[PDB]
Amino acid sequence: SDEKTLTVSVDAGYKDYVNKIKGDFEKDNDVKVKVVEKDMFETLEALPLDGPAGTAPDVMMSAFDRIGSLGQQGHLAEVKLGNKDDYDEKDQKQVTIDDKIYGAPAIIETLVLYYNKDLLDKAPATFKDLETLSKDSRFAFTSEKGKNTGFLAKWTDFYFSYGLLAGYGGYVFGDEGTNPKDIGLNNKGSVEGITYATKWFQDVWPKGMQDNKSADDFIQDQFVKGKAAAILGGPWSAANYKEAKINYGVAKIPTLNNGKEYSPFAGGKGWVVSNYSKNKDVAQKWLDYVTNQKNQETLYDMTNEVPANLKARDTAKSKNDELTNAVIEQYKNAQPMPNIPEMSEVWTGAENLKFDAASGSKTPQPSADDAVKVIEDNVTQKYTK
Numbered sequence: 001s002d003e004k005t006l007t008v009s010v011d012a013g014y015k016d017y018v019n020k021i022k023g024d025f026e027k028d029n030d031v032k033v034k035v036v037e038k039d040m041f042e043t044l045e046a047l048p049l050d051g052p053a054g055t056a057p058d059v060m061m062s063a064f065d066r067i068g069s070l071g072q073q074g075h076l077a078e079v080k081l082g083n084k085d086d087y088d089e090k091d092q093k094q095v096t097i098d099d100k101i102y103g104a105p106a107i108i109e110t111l112v113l114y115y116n117k118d119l120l121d122k123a124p125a126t127f128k129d130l131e132t133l134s135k136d137s138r139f140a141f142t143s144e145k146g147k148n149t150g151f152l153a154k155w156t157d158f159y160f161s162y163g164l165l166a167g168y169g170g171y172v173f174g175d176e177g178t179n180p181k182d183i184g185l186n187n188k189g190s191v192e193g194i195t196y197a198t199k200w201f202q203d204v205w206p207k208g209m210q211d212n213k214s215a216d217d218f219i220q221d222q223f224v225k226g227k228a229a230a231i232l233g234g235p236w237s238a239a240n241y242k243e244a245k246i247n248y249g250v251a252k253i254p255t256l257n258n259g260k261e262y263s264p265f266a267g268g269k270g271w272v273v274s275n276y277s278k279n280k281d282v283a284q285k286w287l288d289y290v291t292n293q294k295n296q297e298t299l300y301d302m303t304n305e306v307p308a309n310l311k312a313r314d315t316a317k318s319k320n321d322e323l324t325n326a327v328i329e330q331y332k333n334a335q336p337m338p339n340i341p342e343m344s345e346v347w348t349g350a351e352n353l354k355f356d357a358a359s360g361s362k363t364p365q366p367s368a369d370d371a372v373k374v375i376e377d378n379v380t381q382k383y384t385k
């Protein structure tokens, strides 16, 4: 009768999963769970209006990069990590801003190296191996003299190239991504990374790799047609390679020339609670439930998304799936993207940073210095000191 209820909103891809696991939660807590399907981002963009109306769901998911911001803006409730003993400090940091926790980590993801097993005997292990692969004429791009598609990476996109700069010692914001007055994108390390990228753009790759607007289309087209042997990509692309029947393999990103690992952004998703919810106690119980080992293993079983819960992540690793193994291994070297507001100013500035050098229009040092000045000035103008 008056036996409480909880509204759980998820993207279409998680509806079956939530329906499978809700039963045991309902029984364990004397609650009725209502499952609604809605695009993840649309739910979050509507929250500021649905919340005061009393029409927003009680719990939903969010990419890690938005949790801090939604928490600061007052749209998400502070929550506890019931499964803290099963989370690395890095994953706790993903859902934390200003020493306040606004979600429970659920899924991890990062960039990996996809390769074609019909073209290569094994995954390249280092960037030195990729450099030699780029001189194998079986991958020559004949319409442009001396260009090669052996290895491709969308380095005009800062989301992709960040891990290269970071592998050399670059960083976005100092104090582990929390100090917007300390920008590391023009430090010695970042410039070494930019310089290395520029060699690929200028000496190896087809001209099309410099056009950020169409580079992803070019890269996917080459890999899916068996013309690129290895490429940098996210887990989200695997489904497409499966659809196209490519005998693809997946590996950690090869080791950089300095002996350090590529250090991409550590992405993923967490479960969050509406700050407007009238069912926060039950919502807290839901977060602790859905992020426990059993339910995290079911998540992986149903969706192939890598669990945040470490006990569940080990179980996923034991399945010996290449994409899962690559993501788990590479995630060890991934750092969280800053979740502070000032991160919004990094994107436009970082475009120029990579492009001006990639195109040979500026040398790497002024390309980086000029872009950092753009970012710094925007931070000063738009945000409180």
Ligand SMILES: OC[C@H]1O[C@H](O[C@H]2[C@H](O)[C@@H](O)[C@@H](O)O[C@@H]2CO)[C@H](O)[C@@H](O)[C@@H]1O
Pocket: 063, 065, 159, 234, 236, 267
């Ligand atoms: O490219 C920048 C963007 O990459 C990732 O977003 C993915 C997303 O996870 C997928 O669902 C699909 O839509 O492809 C997107 C990229 O093409 C990151 O999650 C995101 O933070 C980042 O800005």
Ligand SMILES: O=C([O-])C(O)C(=O)[O-]
Pocket: 277, 278, 279, 280, 281, 282
């Ligand atoms: O259930 C609760 O925790 C309470 O009703 C609230 O969310 O305000």
